[PDB]
A paper describes a structure:
There are no structures for an invertebrate [name] in the protein databank. We expressed and purified Ras from the choanoflagellate [name]. We crystallized Ras from the choanoflagellate [name], and determined structures bound to GDP and GTP at resolutions of 1.85 Å and 1.6 Å, respectively. (B) Sequences of Ras from choanoflagellate ([name]) and sponge (A. queenslandica) are 72% and 80% identical to human H-Ras, respectively. Human SOS stimulates nucleotide exchange with [name] Ras and H-Ras with comparable rates, but only when GDP bound to Ras is exchanged for GDP in solution. When the exchange reaction is carried out with excess GTP in solution, the reaction shows a marked acceleration in rate for human H-Ras, due to the allosteric stimulation of SOS by Ras•GTP. In contrast, [name] Ras is deficient in allosterically stimulating the activity of human SOS.
Consider, for example, the Ras proteins, which are prototypical members of a superfamily of membrane-associated small G-proteins that control an extraordinary range of cellular processes. Ras proteins are capable of producing a diversity of signaling outputs by binding to effector proteins, most importantly to the Raf family of kinases, which activate the MAP kinase pathway. Ras proteins cycle between an active GTP-bound state that transduces signals by binding to effector proteins, and an inactive GDP-bound state that cannot bind to effectors. The switch between the GDP- and GTP-bound states is accompanied by correlated conformational changes distributed throughout the structure of Ras. Two segments of Ras, referred to as Switch I and Switch II, undergo substantial rearrangements when GTP is replaced by GDP, as illustrated schematically in Figure 1 (for a comprehensive review, see Vetter and Wittinghofer, 2001).
Author numbering: -1 to 167
Write the structure that this text describes.
Amino acid sequence: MAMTEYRLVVVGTGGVGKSALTIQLIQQHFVTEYDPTIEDSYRKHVSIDDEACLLDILDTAGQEDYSAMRDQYMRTGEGFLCVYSIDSQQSLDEIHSFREQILRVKDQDEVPMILVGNKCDLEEHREVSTEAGQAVAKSYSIPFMETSAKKRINVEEAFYQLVREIRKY
Ligand SMILES: Nc1nc2c(ncn2[C@@H]2O[C@H](COP(=O)(O)OP(=O)(O)O)[C@@H](O)[C@H]2O)c(=O)[nH]1
Ligand SMILES: [Mg+2]
C-alpha cells in the first residue's frame, strides 16, 4: 500500500529564508549563505498525524523567467508555504501578490497554503508584529505560524500544518 505524496511549493521574496527552512526540514542544519538563485526540489518521508507520507517540496528562487519545472510545480502544487520575514514589512507586503499568483495559476478561489513569518529569532529587528501576521492569515482564512530556521522553531510544524490543510481540502 503506497503512501500519499504531497507536492508543496515554498514561495516568498528573496532573503526571507525559503532555502534555510527547507534545508532545516530535510537536513536538520542551518545554512547561512545559500545561493539565492538555486531552485531545488526535495523529498522527505514523514509521518503526519500518524499517517506516513512523502513530501515533494520545490524551494523556489529568484524571479527570472521560470524553468518548465517551476511552472509545472506552480500548476500541480497541492499546498503553498508563503514565507515572509518578521524583520521586513516589504516581504509581508509581497505576500499579497504571491497569493494572487498562486490562485491565478491554480485557477481556484482557495488553495491550501500557510502564512509563515520566518526569522522569529530576530526580535530586535522585528518590523511585522505577530498580530499583523495573524491578521493577514485570518483575512485570507489560512493558517499562520512564526518560524525560525536559525533556532529551529516550528520548522516541521509549518510543513506538517500545510499537509493538514491539504487533507482538509
Ligand atoms: N536570524 C535568522 N536568519 C535567517 C533565518 N532563516 C534564514 N536566515 C538568513 O537569511 C538569509 C537568507 O536565507 P535564505 O534561506 O537563502 O532565503 P531565501 O532567498 O528565501 O532562500 C541567510 O543568510 C540566512 O542565514 C532565521 O530563521 N533566522
Ligand atoms: Mg533560496
